[PDB]
Scaffold this active site. Sequence first.
Site, mmCIF file in Angstrom:
data_model
loop_
_atom_site.group_PDB
_atom_site.id
_atom_site.type_symbol
_atom_site.label_atom_id
_atom_site.label_comp_id
_atom_site.label_asym_id
_atom_site.label_seq_id
_atom_site.Cartn_x
_atom_site.Cartn_y
_atom_site.Cartn_z
ATOM 1 N N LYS A 186 3.237 -6.655 39.020
ATOM 2 C CA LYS A 186 2.847 -5.375 38.443
ATOM 3 C C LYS A 186 2.179 -5.568 37.092
ATOM 4 O O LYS A 186 1.122 -4.986 36.825
ATOM 5 C CB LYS A 186 4.063 -4.462 38.317
ATOM 6 C CG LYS A 186 4.502 -3.883 39.642
ATOM 7 C CD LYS A 186 5.866 -3.218 39.566
ATOM 8 C CE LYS A 186 5.815 -1.901 38.824
ATOM 9 N NZ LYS A 186 7.105 -1.167 38.939
ATOM 10 N N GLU B 256 12.694 0.774 28.956
ATOM 11 C CA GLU B 256 12.811 -0.395 29.816
ATOM 12 C C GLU B 256 13.266 -1.592 28.991
ATOM 13 O O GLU B 256 13.470 -1.499 27.780
ATOM 14 C CB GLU B 256 11.492 -0.680 30.531
ATOM 15 C CG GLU B 256 11.239 0.254 31.686
ATOM 16 C CD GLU B 256 12.230 0.053 32.811
ATOM 17 O OE1 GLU B 256 12.720 -1.082 32.966
ATOM 18 O OE2 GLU B 256 12.533 1.024 33.533
ATOM 19 N N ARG B 257 13.423 -2.730 29.656
ATOM 20 C CA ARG B 257 14.045 -3.883 29.027
ATOM 21 C C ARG B 257 13.196 -4.386 27.873
ATOM 22 O O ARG B 257 11.972 -4.472 27.986
ATOM 23 C CB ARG B 257 14.231 -4.993 30.052
ATOM 24 C CG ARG B 257 15.036 -4.604 31.268
ATOM 25 C CD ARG B 257 15.181 -5.780 32.203
ATOM 26 N NE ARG B 257 15.937 -5.445 33.401
ATOM 27 C CZ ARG B 257 15.423 -4.840 34.462
ATOM 28 N NH1 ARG B 257 14.146 -4.498 34.480
ATOM 29 N NH2 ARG B 257 16.185 -4.577 35.510
HETATM 30 N N1 LIG Z 1 -3.652 -12.352 40.800
HETATM 31 C C1 LIG Z 1 -2.754 -13.331 40.821
HETATM 32 N N2 LIG Z 1 -3.189 -14.609 40.899
HETATM 33 C C2 LIG Z 1 -2.281 -15.592 40.918
HETATM 34 N N3 LIG Z 1 -0.956 -15.512 40.873
HETATM 35 C C3 LIG Z 1 -0.554 -14.235 40.800
HETATM 36 C C4 LIG Z 1 -1.364 -13.120 40.772
HETATM 37 N N4 LIG Z 1 -0.598 -11.969 40.701
HETATM 38 C C5 LIG Z 1 0.637 -12.400 40.679
HETATM 39 N N5 LIG Z 1 0.733 -13.764 40.748
HETATM 40 C C6 LIG Z 1 1.951 -14.559 40.743
HETATM 41 O O1 LIG Z 1 3.063 -13.694 40.817
HETATM 42 C C7 LIG Z 1 3.767 -13.706 39.549
HETATM 43 C C8 LIG Z 1 4.230 -12.314 39.199
HETATM 44 O O2 LIG Z 1 4.890 -12.355 37.914
HETATM 45 P P1 LIG Z 1 4.915 -11.042 36.995
HETATM 46 O O3 LIG Z 1 3.515 -10.650 36.667
HETATM 47 O O4 LIG Z 1 5.871 -11.253 35.870
HETATM 48 O O5 LIG Z 1 5.554 -9.971 37.992
HETATM 49 P P2 LIG Z 1 6.566 -8.773 37.685
HETATM 50 O O6 LIG Z 1 6.014 -8.064 36.503
HETATM 51 O O7 LIG Z 1 6.628 -7.895 38.895
HETATM 52 O O8 LIG Z 1 7.869 -9.444 37.390
HETATM 53 C C9 LIG Z 1 2.789 -14.372 38.575
HETATM 54 O O9 LIG Z 1 3.435 -14.957 37.452
HETATM 55 C C10 LIG Z 1 2.132 -15.405 39.488
HETATM 56 O O10 LIG Z 1 2.994 -16.491 39.738
#
Ligand SMILES: Nc1ncnc2c1ncn2[C@@H]1O[C@H](COP(=O)(O)OP(=O)(O)O)[C@@H](O)[C@H]1O
Lengths: 513, 85, 458, 460, 52, 52, 173
Positions: free
Chosen positions: D156, D182-183
């Site tokens: 997200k 939120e956190r």
């Molecule tokens: N567009 C993208 N390209 C490559 N990896 C991605 C992409 N979107 C998500 N990811 C992967 O998924 C992970 C989602 O982490 P994060 O952004 O912290 O999700 P959330 O906020 O839901 O916890 C990224 O750190 C990466 O490993």
Amino acid sequence: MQLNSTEISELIKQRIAQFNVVSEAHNEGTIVSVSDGVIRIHGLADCMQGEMISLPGNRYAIALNLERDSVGAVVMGPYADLAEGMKVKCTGRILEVPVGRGLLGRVVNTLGAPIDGKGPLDHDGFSAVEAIAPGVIERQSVDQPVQTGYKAVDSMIPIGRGQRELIIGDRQTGKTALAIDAIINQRDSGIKCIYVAIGQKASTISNVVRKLEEHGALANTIVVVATASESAALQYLAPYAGCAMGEYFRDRGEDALIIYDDLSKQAVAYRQISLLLRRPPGREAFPGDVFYLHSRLLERAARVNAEYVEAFTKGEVKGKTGSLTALPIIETQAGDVSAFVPTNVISITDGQIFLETNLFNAGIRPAVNPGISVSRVGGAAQTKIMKKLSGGIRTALAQYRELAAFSQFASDLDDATRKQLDHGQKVTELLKQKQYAPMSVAQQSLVLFAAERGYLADVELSKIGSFEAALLAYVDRDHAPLMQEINQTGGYNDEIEGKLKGILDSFKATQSW
Amino acid sequence: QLNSTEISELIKQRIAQFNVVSEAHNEGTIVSVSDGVIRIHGLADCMQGEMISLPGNRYAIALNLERDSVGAVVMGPYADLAEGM
Amino acid sequence: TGKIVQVIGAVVDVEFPQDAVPRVYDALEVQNGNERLVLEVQQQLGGGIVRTIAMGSSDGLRRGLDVKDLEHPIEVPVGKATLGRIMNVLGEPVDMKGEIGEEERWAIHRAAPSYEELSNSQELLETGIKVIDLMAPFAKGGKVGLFGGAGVGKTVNMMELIRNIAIEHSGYSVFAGVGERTREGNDFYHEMTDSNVIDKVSLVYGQMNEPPGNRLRVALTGLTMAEKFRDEGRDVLLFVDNIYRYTLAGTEVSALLGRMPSAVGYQPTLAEEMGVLQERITSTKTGSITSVQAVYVPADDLTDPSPATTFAHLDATVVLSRQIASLGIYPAVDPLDSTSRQLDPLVVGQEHYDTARGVQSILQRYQELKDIIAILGMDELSEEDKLVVARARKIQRFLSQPFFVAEVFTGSPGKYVSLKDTIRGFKGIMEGEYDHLPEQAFYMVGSIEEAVEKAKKL
Amino acid sequence: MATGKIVQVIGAVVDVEFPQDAVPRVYDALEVQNGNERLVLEVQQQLGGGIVRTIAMGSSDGLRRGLDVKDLEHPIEVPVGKATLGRIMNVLGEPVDMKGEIGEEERWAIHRAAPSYEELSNSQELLETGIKVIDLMAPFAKGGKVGLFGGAGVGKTVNMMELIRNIAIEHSGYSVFAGVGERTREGNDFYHEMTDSNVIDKVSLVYGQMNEPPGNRLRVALTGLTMAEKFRDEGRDVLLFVDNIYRYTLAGTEVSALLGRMPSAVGYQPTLAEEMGVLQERITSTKTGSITSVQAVYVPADDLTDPSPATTFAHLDATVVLSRQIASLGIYPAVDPLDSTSRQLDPLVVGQEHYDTARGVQSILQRYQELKDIIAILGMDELSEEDKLVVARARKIQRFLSQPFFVAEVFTGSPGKYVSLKDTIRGFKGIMEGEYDHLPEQAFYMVGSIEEAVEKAKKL
Amino acid sequence: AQAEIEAERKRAREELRKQVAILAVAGAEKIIERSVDEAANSDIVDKLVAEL
Amino acid sequence: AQAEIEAERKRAREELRKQVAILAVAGAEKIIERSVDEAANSDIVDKLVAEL
Amino acid sequence: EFITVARPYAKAAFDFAVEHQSVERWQDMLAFAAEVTKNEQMAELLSGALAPETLAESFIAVAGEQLDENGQNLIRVMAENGRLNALPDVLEQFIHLRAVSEATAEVDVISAAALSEQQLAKISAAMEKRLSRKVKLNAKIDKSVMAGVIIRAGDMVIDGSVRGRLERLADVL
Ligand SMILES: Nc1ncnc2c1ncn2[C@@H]1O[C@H](COP(=O)(O)OP(=O)(O)O)[C@@H](O)[C@H]1O
Ligand SMILES: Nc1ncnc2c1ncn2[C@@H]1O[C@H](COP(=O)(O)OP(=O)(O)OP(=O)(O)O)[C@@H](O)[C@H]1O
Ligand SMILES: Nc1ncnc2c1ncn2[C@@H]1O[C@H](COP(=O)(O)OP(=O)(O)O)[C@@H](O)[C@H]1O
Ligand SMILES: [Mg+2]
Ligand SMILES: [Mg+2]
């Protein structure tokens, strides 16, 4: 051209003349409390319940309680800038709204103030917002038809002048579409229209008004608007203002059509106003009189006999009968037609059009679910031709649609059910219709003719729509006299049946489709 | 802030003489009538559950013994009753 | 001689001299501008105050107005002079004809007839409706109630019962409209006037437009006329348009009278307010009242306090359900919940009773199988459970009937089915003598011969 | 000069008594010396007798009765404009990072009326986000609200960073991020994940997190929204993120209970729909500019009928659902095409070609969803060859919805791509109507436009 | 039409500046029935003129 | 389009009327306060007490 | 606020004072009691939970100005009901019931400048006809209003000011 500064100046010049400077006595009070839009006034020993109290600025509050030592009132507008100690003046007026045919084409606040930019109103005096509908002896049975643009509701669910017909369904199912298409279709039929928007997003209302103006209907409608950001006392009192503006026509021997955009959001705003006054709630936390709220509103959409119109208008109008037709809209969470407020309203109106989300997602639009939707006045409201051609078509579809439930797996009697299925299915593919495309009773009638007389058993489900387009173009070129006749009359006879059969055989024989 | 059967003439009686004489702990006067419950003023010697005798041949059951009130339920048609009895 | 001191919604507080305070249920009067407003007192608060309900629009009342104490309760015209005329809750004439030439007026608050005076009757009443007088037959001089949600048929059924019982009945009749549509009141008035039966029916109407006090007391205003006709030695029909509104109007006013809310926001006196009315609508040794009452059940909840407390006051209870109407099966009576005090071997004979209980047993057995059919499909039933299911569906169809008052809806002509002619058809369907016919051969027909005759056309 | 005196203190609710003619108006701000630091109170009600009931924008421990209270004559005012980009602020507009003062010149009150009826834009544009899945299956209206129903572990926040990047570079708009309840842990690493992607200078951050008293969590969304309104008045197109609208509802429920008002539908405040509308009605496209909003929504008990989701959905235009599954298969962004929806998908607004293209890919994928159910139980070769074509086209469509973000380079290495709408309509018309059948599915994965899919197939 | 109207607006305004000063006097003489002279206001009417 | 033009004309005319309207009362108030005096004030109070 | 709980006590005190033709003594007695209620220390005692017949006696002790029977009895009743703080309002409603009984009224006259004392004579003569009551006047001066006069008599007002004329013209347009 019409920026005639001379007229702009003489306009104000007249006001400076017809202005009375003489003193006048009035009764005064003080604001003692302010919270969440409710006001507590001390004084006003001469206030009367239901009155309009005038606040600093150009603002009003409605007197709800006459307690022993204070008056409780709700502010009709932004209340935040009021302060303890401000004086308020008791106007001797019960809550009132401007009315007249000069409102047509205006967009108006629930208090009657014009919110479009086009300047003050031309109006025929004021009318009371809270009134009691005509009695049992003043009514008359609803007789005349009100034509929407839609084959589905004009055939299965007829609406008559003086009826009340709930449009109910889940969110994003075409309720507003099905309502403003009915408004647009009155563009020429001599019925004034009123559209009340309660709790709607302002962008949605601006788009609705833009589409009303696009199709020319805006010159024939009044728009009463109370947006989601408005006070809960303006949302709650809006539909009474709209009904007060429609009763003006009803009582003068004319016809009107009024649409309440959401009476679920009116109920929610009333629940707010009620809980802020500490009133014990009932089922689903709605007040005790949440039924009376909608009852005393919708019971005004009436048709009145000629003696009532004569007596009301002091003998100026003879032999005409006025009416006010209401289409309230209700939103149902998860298709539940069995919750406290949807049932309260199903219990008040004269029928309901139920829009089903399963049909709406499957491309069937308008998604009129037969079997649940009915017109309690029945066929008495239809034109003779439409009454004949339609028959019990809606129960035929209501059967076919359950037969499709068991036939989903297997079927016996598997020819007659086979042809029953094929027919009902082609008819459903025929009832779906595009938005903003109304069609006159002549077109609906000859299409229902084609559907009933077996003239579509040849062409595929894939072909229906272009078949209808070509048929409506063919008869537009050739038989314009017969269309001009059926649109001018109820228009059913063996002669017209013959003319229609001849049009049908001929088109199928030589026409393109 | 709401009253508790402090009303004009009852107050005036006390203005005349606060420590009213112990004229009769045996009797009292109806001050309210509603929905089959009456509030009685006086009856210093009422007991919970006691039968109280009304005009006619009717009775009430003293259920609430409060500070300056007895709440009693009428055992029969109550609409005939009236304040001051 | 009194002053208004508060106005909260529909309830008004008035202050009187200490020696002149009105009695409970006495009627007061106020000049609401160019109007005359009647108040009926509900409570004697302390100190000369009295709390009242307005029999009219409360808007426009100032504090400090002067109210006049009429020293008698609300009183309505009654008797033969009130016949064929429409009246207010206050007994005033609402049709445009002249004054009511009544000789006598009665107060609308009365005590129920003694236990000593009651009467009981086994005399069955026949109606043209298959399901009603199979599953829930009712008797002359007894109470019937139609329970249903919003828009399931409890007004059409009552108009059919009017047609089938009231035209073919010699005595007078009374129809009280309590909080329902004025359109329907006008329609009914003109149907009666155009069929020249209006001179045998007395109409009281307190419809949904009116303020709470009218809806609250109109039912008593109607019972008073029915009681006058009863005591004259006659036997009467009393039709009530929706008795639920009589308690809803009490719920709307209860909190303003300063009473603590009960289970679902209902007034604390719900069961007493309901019993004090329904205990005086009864037949007696001097004359009998036969009554049909429509009873709205909110949100289709048959356990809501109001239907739940109403059930106990009726002899025959007919329960209409939305899940049956949505199948197009009218009248949408639920035969596993309709019941009657009269369904006994001693009252209706052994054949009628035995057929009714057989129908119930089959339909309940069919209800028990509806979940296994839903999950695993119908092919997993034993060879005879499929037979149970087919007969249950045939019976479901056969309970449907066309009505003379529903021609406006379906076009099909009405049917009148005699009792002798329906217990035979159901004995036939159950015993197996009509398995050959398709299900749709039974849908919306009269006698069974019409079903065997309809099968010929599919 | 101070004039009021604290008269009650109960939890977060504080009552102060003023001279009888100087009573504050509602929503006016007050302040008191809570020992060694000042505290700001917001008026909520006026009771009789000069008493006014307030809620403390801070911890109320240490408040005595009788403290002097100073009546600021205006609502809570915050700094607005270019000066606030890249900073962090709390409800009161105080710099909460350590970088010192905020050099604004203008301060706005956070309470305002929605744009009037004749200010709204008499048109209906679309916001070209530059992401394929969103612009095809769930387009954004310029000035609309977008729900974002993804869970956790799906990206997200990287989607949010990609939108922040695109609307700043490829448009000339800024962004505002309002963190409602939120956190704090997530806020610290959103700040870092943005600072090390060079977008921090294009977003204005405001935070009221779960550790904050109720009044902060209530009014922080209005602070963020008024900064976005200041940007709109400059004529820009702005993007406003709300970290959870559900917590904006719950903060209002808490405050309402504190004020003692009667509860409503399922325990919520009696003014739920008005508190929601007075926020959601300020973010609209105006004749001068527009505010678009992307709002994360949490549905209680997974019940879409609960009053809070039901009230929020009355305002959302689009709706994108993220799915753990689509991420497991290695596709990013992990948007679900079958549950994502937008009420902009109508021929009358978005055009006929785009409409029927989106409907195409929708039907193709929702058939493939059950052909792959067959394959699991009966094996591949059970399928008709009329279906082995549907599977091979669905797999390619499914791949082509992936995209490389300028923000994901740190993971993928591949350069980020911004795909115009035209390109997506071309690409999906192509794939659906059998063109490009001659090249393998991995020629589509993570590629960008289709003119790049052909090249990736060339060098494959 | 929009540019036409924007020109018409100036055409009208520059004449209505002649009427503001007449209405400002007639309104006062209605409110204060001791009819008033122009002379004492000749400068005030000029700022009313200007600010339109 | 031809009805949108007319709506624009109505709206512009209304805004112009609004401006002139409020300047009229502002001017009348300034004229009044620059021209009220005891001879007229006594006559106003005399008028209203003659009908008080 | 005690506007409502004061009405019964003021009515009883007035009906008693009339029977004994001591209205003036009762008014001064109430005016003294409502003052002792305002003292800094007594307002502390009135809030703490003392038993009524102790609070009442400590309050009686601070007043030899009360005729030992009928004023002290009123104090004892109000104390038993927990309403000693209502005295400042019992006084106002007692004065009101008196002004009603003796058919007297008190008019405020608000003006941009003091009046000529013949205008005042005619104003009082006029109001004593608008109202049955013999009217006092309290002339007051306020330069916001700039001509004409405001007459306020109870909750009735006559807005004769030119300021009112201006604000009422602005809203016609
Ligand atoms: N567009 C993208 N390209 C490559 N990896 C991605 C992409 N979107 C998500 N990811 C992967 O998924 C992970 C989602 O982490 P994060 O952004 O912290 O999700 P959330 O906020 O839901 O916890 C990224 O750190 C990466 O490993
Ligand atoms: N006859 C039709 N054919 C095709 N589409 C239709 C038809 N009627 C309505 N729609 C579509 O349905 C969508 C929603 O319709 P509408 O907004 O009228 O429903 P609604 O119930 O008012 O929604 P809301 O509850 O959000 O106001 C519109 O985008 C419109 O394009
Ligand atoms: N016997 C019937 N045949 C056909 N339709 C019926 C029948 N009874 C009821 N209906 C349908 O049910 C609708 C509900 O009407 P009604 O009986 O008045 O409901 P309610 O009981 O709430 O008044 C009728 O308008 C009609 O459409
Ligand atoms: Mg809608
Ligand atoms: Mg009914």
